[PDB]
Design an enzyme around this catalytic site. Sequence first.
Site, short mmCIF file in Angstrom:
data_model
loop_
_atom_site.label_atom_id
_atom_site.label_comp_id
_atom_site.label_asym_id
_atom_site.label_seq_id
_atom_site.Cartn_x
_atom_site.Cartn_y
_atom_site.Cartn_z
N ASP A 193 -88.19 -48.84 -48.24
CA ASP A 193 -87.82 -47.49 -47.71
C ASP A 193 -87.12 -46.69 -48.79
OD1 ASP A 193 -87.15 -45.32 -46.13
OD2 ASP A 193 -85.66 -46.52 -44.91
N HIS A 383 -83.94 -53.17 -52.81
CA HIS A 383 -84.40 -54.49 -52.33
C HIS A 383 -85.28 -55.06 -53.46
CE1 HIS A 383 -83.00 -53.46 -48.28
NE2 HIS A 383 -83.74 -52.31 -48.36
N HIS A 532 -74.88 -47.29 -40.62
CA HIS A 532 -75.93 -46.45 -41.26
C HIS A 532 -75.38 -45.04 -41.53
CE1 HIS A 532 -79.98 -44.46 -41.39
NE2 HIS A 532 -80.25 -45.57 -42.11
N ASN A 589 -94.70 -38.41 -44.11
CA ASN A 589 -93.37 -38.65 -44.70
C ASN A 589 -92.33 -38.87 -43.61
OD1 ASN A 589 -91.58 -36.09 -44.13
ND2 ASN A 589 -93.67 -35.29 -44.70
N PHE A 593 -84.74 -39.09 -43.48
CA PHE A 593 -84.34 -40.52 -43.47
C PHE A 593 -84.08 -41.11 -44.82
CE2 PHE A 593 -85.24 -40.38 -38.99
CZ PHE A 593 -84.29 -41.28 -38.47
#
Lengths: 1015, 204, 197
Positions: A193, A383, A532, A589, A593
Amino acid sequence: VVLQRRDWENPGVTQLNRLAAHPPFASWRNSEEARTDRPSQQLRSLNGEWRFAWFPAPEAVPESWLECDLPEADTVVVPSNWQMHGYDAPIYTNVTYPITVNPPFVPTENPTGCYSLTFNVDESWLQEGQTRIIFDGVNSAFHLWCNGRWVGYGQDSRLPSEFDLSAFLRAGENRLAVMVLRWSDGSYLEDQDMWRMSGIFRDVSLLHKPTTQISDFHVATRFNDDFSRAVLEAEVQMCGELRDYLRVTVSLWQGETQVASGTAPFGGEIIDERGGYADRVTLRLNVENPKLWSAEIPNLYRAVVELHTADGTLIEAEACDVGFREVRIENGLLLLNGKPLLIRGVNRHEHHPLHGQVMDEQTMVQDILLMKQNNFNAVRCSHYPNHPLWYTLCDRYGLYVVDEANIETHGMVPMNRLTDDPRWLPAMSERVTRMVQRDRNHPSVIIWSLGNESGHGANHDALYRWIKSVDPSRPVQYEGGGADTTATDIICPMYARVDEDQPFPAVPKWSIKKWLSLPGETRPLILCEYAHAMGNSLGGFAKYWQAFRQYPRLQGGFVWDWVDQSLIKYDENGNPWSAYGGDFGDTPNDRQFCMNGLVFADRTPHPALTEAKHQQQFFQFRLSGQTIEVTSEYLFRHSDNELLHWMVALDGKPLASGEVPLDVAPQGKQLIELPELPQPESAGQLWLTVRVVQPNATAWSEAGHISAWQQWRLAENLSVTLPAASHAIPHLTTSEMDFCIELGNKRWQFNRQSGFLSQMWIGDKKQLLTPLRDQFTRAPLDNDIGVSEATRIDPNAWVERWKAAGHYQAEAALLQCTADTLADAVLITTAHAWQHQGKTLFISRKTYRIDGSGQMAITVDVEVASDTPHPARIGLNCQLAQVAERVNWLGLGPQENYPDRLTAACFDRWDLPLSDMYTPYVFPSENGLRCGTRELNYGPHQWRGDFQFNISRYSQQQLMETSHRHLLHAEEGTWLNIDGFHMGIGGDDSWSPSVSAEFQLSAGRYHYQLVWCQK
Amino acid sequence: DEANIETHGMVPMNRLTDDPRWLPAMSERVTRMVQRDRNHPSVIIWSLGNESGHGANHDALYRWIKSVDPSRPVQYEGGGADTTATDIICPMYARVDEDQPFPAVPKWSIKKWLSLPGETRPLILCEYAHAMGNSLGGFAKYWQAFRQYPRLQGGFVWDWVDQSLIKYDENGNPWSAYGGDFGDTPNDRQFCMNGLVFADRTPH
Amino acid sequence: VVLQRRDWENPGVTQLNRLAAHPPFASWRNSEEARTDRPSQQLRSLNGEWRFAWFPAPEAVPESWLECDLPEADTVVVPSNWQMHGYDAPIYTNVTYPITVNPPFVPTENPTGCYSLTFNVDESWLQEGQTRIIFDGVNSAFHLWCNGRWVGYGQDSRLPSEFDLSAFLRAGENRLAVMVLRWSDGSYLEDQDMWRM
Ligand SMILES: [Cl-]
Ligand SMILES: [K+]
Ligand SMILES: [K+]
Ligand SMILES: [K+]
Ligand SMILES: [K+]
Ligand SMILES: [K+]
Ligand SMILES: [K+]
Ligand SMILES: [Mg+2]
Ligand SMILES: [Mg+2]
Ligand SMILES: [Mg+2]
Ligand SMILES: [Mg+2]
Ligand SMILES: [Mg+2]
Ligand SMILES: [Mg+2]
C-alpha cells in the site's frame, strides 16, 4: 534488443548471473581505514548523471541502444524513480493490484526504462582481482549489459543485485546499459500500500575485491547470566585461492582501544562424514563487562575482519559496528539484555514528496531525530528491506528495527493464493534469505518479519523455520493469516483494539487484552500496526498505552504510520501543492488513503505527533499531597541528563516554579517533595505542570529538550463574589420581525422569523456576517468517511449515517421566540426543532440574558432523538465580521486537541496567531478544535464557559466540500464554532467506525452555557 | 517415500543443502513428491533424501511437509540421524551394543541412543545389516534388541537386490558385471552388490 | 536460445513451462470406469519404438533434427537407459561424483540422447480440451519440441515432468523431439550410490 525468454513473466527466474548476497563490504586494503569506517578506494559510487529513455514496452527498445547512446535520451540523476521526472504516472492503489491479476503474466504495455552510463575504470582494477557492480535497488526487474554484452538479470526491488564485470570491462571508458521493466512477475510479490513507481532508485556502486577474499561473515554475541561476560563469535567465509598460509584476524575496538583479538587459519570443525568447511573459520573473543547496546544507550564496538597471510600481508579487511545485546523470548516476554521491552514503535515507508522512493542521508537523519525526539524507540521497515544506510543510522542513534522481507500479495484472492503455492516458494525464499544474509550483523535489527499482508501459506512456515535455523538470535514474526499463526513468535496484529473484539471469520482481531489469554496462548503481543494516523486521528491513543503499561505481555506496537505519502505537483503559477491518489490520472486509485502519517510529507508534524510523544514518555508520575513520585521506564540507563521543572499557576497566572534534578535508576522511583505552595485568595483553579528537560545536548536532541510532562489540578477556589450592580438597564424595542436590545454603545438584534441573533453592534460596528445558529454536524474527518465513496457508499460509516438521517440538510423550525424586560436585563427565550422529512432530530431551547453590564448569558438545552445517529457535535456557529491577528484562550493547548486526543494538551493561557488555529490536513475536514476551554478572546470579544472551539477563515461547508487544502480560500471574516460537546475523532482504523462509546454523543439531553462580552 | 536429493560427494556433505541458493531446486524435489504421492495409504513416512549432511534447507522443507501433510512423520538421517529435521532417530549402520563415537556424527549403540539425555523419539534404522557378499553376520542381534526395547521399532536392511549388470563374453554367454567392468573409472568395484538377492532375484 | 541459455548449468532453472505436479490422473469420462480402475481412453501410452541418436555434447546436435528424423538414428525401445543399448558406458561410483565437482557446471563433453517419435491424436483432441505429455522419468534433464517448436524443459530424474501440447498439435502426423542431457546441475542432487545411467 534480443529477449525471447521473457524472464519477467516467470517466477522461476528471479535472477541470472547474480552474485551471492552478503553483509555490507568495502574491501579496505588498510585495516585502520576499516576500523574508522572511512571511505574505501575500492568502493566507488556510480551515482550522478546517467542517460535515460522511456519506452512503452521492452519490444520497442532498439538494439542500437546496447552499443550506442540514443540521441533522444535525456540526462537524468540516478538514483531516481522515473515517475518523479514526469515520464509516466505514479499510481496510488492500496490492495487492488495495478495490473490485471493473471500470474505470472504482466501487461504487454509495460513501461521500460533504458538507463545507461559511460564511466571510467582504472587499469589497476583490471590487472588483478574482481570488479563487481552493485545495484542497491531497481524496481521491479532488469537486464544488464556492459560494453554491449549481456551480463545478467535481477528481481526484488528492495535488495542489492551484484554482478561480476571483471570479464566485461576494459581500461578507461566503459558503457553500462540497464533495461528496467516496471512490471514483472516480482510485482505479484510487491503489492504494498504505497505509490507504484519504478527505476534505479537506490545507489549504484562498483566494488573491487581481491581474488582471495572475504565472501561472508557473521557476528554473534552471547552472554552469561547477568550480562557481565560475553563471547563474540565471528564466522568468516572466503572464496578464491585457499592455502595454508591464510589467516583471519578479528579484532574488536572501543574507539581507539583494542579490547580483544583472535587469529586463526581456515578450516572449521568437522560437521559431518565428509569433514568440515575448509573455507571457513570461527573466531571467538572473550569480552569482559561489555558496554551493552540498546535504543536507550546504543553502545557500539567496531569489529575489523582481516584476511591475511600468516606472515603479515593484509589481503583485505571488512568491518562492522557491533552492538552487544541478546534478544530472546522467555516465558511469554520479549527480552532485550534480560529486560522486557516496551516498543514505542512506528512503521516507516521510504517516501519523499519530491524524490519519491529515493532515500538520502539527510532525510533519514531528519526522520530518526524526529522519531527519537518524540519518544519513539522502534521502527518497522514496512514492508521491505530498507536502504542500507538506514540500519547504520539505527545502530548508531539507537532504534530497535523489525526488518521485513519484500513480500506482499494483498490483492490475491484469497490472500494466501501465492504463499501457499510451492511454485512461488523459490521467489519468496530469495526475498527472505537475501535479506537475512545482508542485514544479520546489524544490532538494531532485533526481529525478522516474513513480509506483510500475504495470508498464511506453507511457504511462510518453511521460511519461518529457515530463519530460525540460520539465525537463532532473533525472533521471527509475521501477521498474515490471523496474527497468531505457526509462522510467528509474536502475536502481531494490525488494528486490534484495546477492549473491543472484532470477531471476523477465520482472521478475527480480538481485543489485545483478551488475545493474550486465549486457551493455550503464551506469546508476547506487539501490534505490527495500530493507531491509524489518517487525517485528524489518533483518537484513543492513550487507551493503548494504559493497556501496554498494565499488562506485561502487551509489549507495545508500531503506529501506522510515520509520514504521509503525498507527492508535490505544481499549479498553473508554478506553486507546489500536495497531491494524493488519482492526482496523476492514476485509476483505479485509493485517493487520500496514502496519507496516514504522524508527519506531513515535508516532515512538519501533524497535531497527533504530540499525543504520541506524551503517551510514549519514559517517566511516569503520581502526585500525593506535597509529593511527586517519578517512575523511570528506562530499562538500562539512569536519568543522567534530566531535570524536573515544576510550575504552579492560577488560571494561567504564574504563581511559583522551581527545578529539581532527576536522579532515578532504570525502573526506579524518586520522590520529590514540593516547597510550600502559594494559597492565593483569588478565585480560580491552581494547576501544577511538570516537565522533564534534558540540560545537555545529545546526538539526537538539543540542550533544553523536553522529553515528558504531566499536569494536575491542585486546590480550586470557586468564585462566590457578586458582580458590581451596574445602574444601566438595557432597553428593548419590538417589531413584528425583530427584538432589538440596546445598552450604551452596544446593540443586539434577534430575528423573530428565524429565532436567532442576526446582528450585534459594538460602538456602531456590525459584528456578524452570518447569524449565531446551532450546529450539529462537522466537516467529516477521514475516520468519519472510512471507505465510503459517492459511487460505492458504505452505509455504516459515520458520515453516511449522518447524511442518511438528514443531519446535514435539517432545517430549523422555530417553535418559540419571546422577549421579556426584567429588573436589570432583557431575556430572550427561543426554541427550535430540526427536522428532516417529518422526523424531529434535535430540539434546541435557549435563553439569552442581556444585563446592564453588557454581558450576554446564553443557556442552551438540546434534545437529541435517541434513534438518530449520535451527532458529531452540539454547539453554536457564526461568521464574525472581525479578522484579528491573535487568538488567546484559557484551556487545553497549544495544539489542536479533541476529546479522545487531548492527553498531551495542557491547561494554561495560550496565545497564537490565527493561522496556527487551523491545521492544514491535505484532505480538509473539521480541524483545530481545542477542548476544555474556559475563556476565549478574539478581537473585542470574550466568551467564557466550559466549551470546545475552533476558529478560522474556513466554514465547515467549505472544508466539507473541498478535496485538497490548496483549493481552500479564506472567507470574509472569521468562522467560530463553539461546542458544548464534540464527538471523538477515532482512528483505531480508518475504514470502520472507531470512536469508542464513551466519546459518542449519546446522552439524549445536553446542556451548556456561555457568556459573551466585550473584554 | 524419499525425495530425490543426495549430495554425498560434497565436502562437507551439507555444502549445497546449507546454501539458500540451492533451496529452490531442493524444494521441488520434496514438494513435487508430496504432491504426487500423498494419497497413497502405503506411504507412511516422508524422507527428505539421503546423505546430504544437515543444512538449513532441510529444516525449511521438514517444516513445509509438516505444514501441508500432518498425517505422516518426516524422517531424514543426514547430519547424525537425530537432527531437528527428523521425527524418527534413523541412523544407518548403528550397531546394537557397540558405540562408534565419530566426531559430529557418532553412530551410538541403538540401545544407548534411545536414552541419551532429553531424547524421546522412536528409532528405526534407515539402513542396517549391509548384505554385501557373504554377510548378515549378527542379524539376530538386531532382532533380539528390536523385540526387547519398545522404542527400537526395527529398520530397513541394505539392501534388496545386487546392482550387477549382464555382460556377454566372446561366446555370447552372460556374466554378472560390477563397477569398472564397463571401463568406467574411477569406480567402486563390487560395492554395487549389497543385495539379499542376486540381480535375477535368486536368493543369497 | 536453447544452446545459448545452458539451462542445465543453473540450479535456478529446474524447468520451463512445466505443469504443476498432482496425484495420478486418467481423466475418466465415465464414473464406473473410474470406480473399477479400468483404462481411460483419454490416457494413452507412447511407450514402444522411438527413434534415437546419441551425441557427445548438445553442441553436436544438428538443428535439422528438430524438423526431420536423422537417417543415422536407430529405432529403440522406450523406456530405456541408453547405456543398456550400448551407446555409452554406465558408471559405478559410490560417493565421488562422476563429474568434476564445480557446481553448477557440468562437463563440456555431456552425452546427449536425441529421441523422437511420430504420432497422431484423435480428432476430438484437435477440436477441444487440454492434451499434455507426461514423462515419468528422464535422466537427468531434457528439452522438448513438438512439430519443430520448443515446448519446455525439465529436471529431477525421478518425478514426472508434464507439458501442455494443446497449442502445438496439428492434424495428421506430429513429431516429438526430446533432447536428453546426461549431466545437468540436477546431477549435483543425484549422487546416489548406484549405476549412473
Ligand atoms: Cl583502503
Ligand atoms: K507491557
Ligand atoms: K494507506
Ligand atoms: K490534557
Ligand atoms: K473535504
Ligand atoms: K520394539
Ligand atoms: K553400495
Ligand atoms: Mg521472473
Ligand atoms: Mg594488526
Ligand atoms: Mg496491503
Ligand atoms: Mg495528563
Ligand atoms: Mg538447471
Ligand atoms: Mg551415498
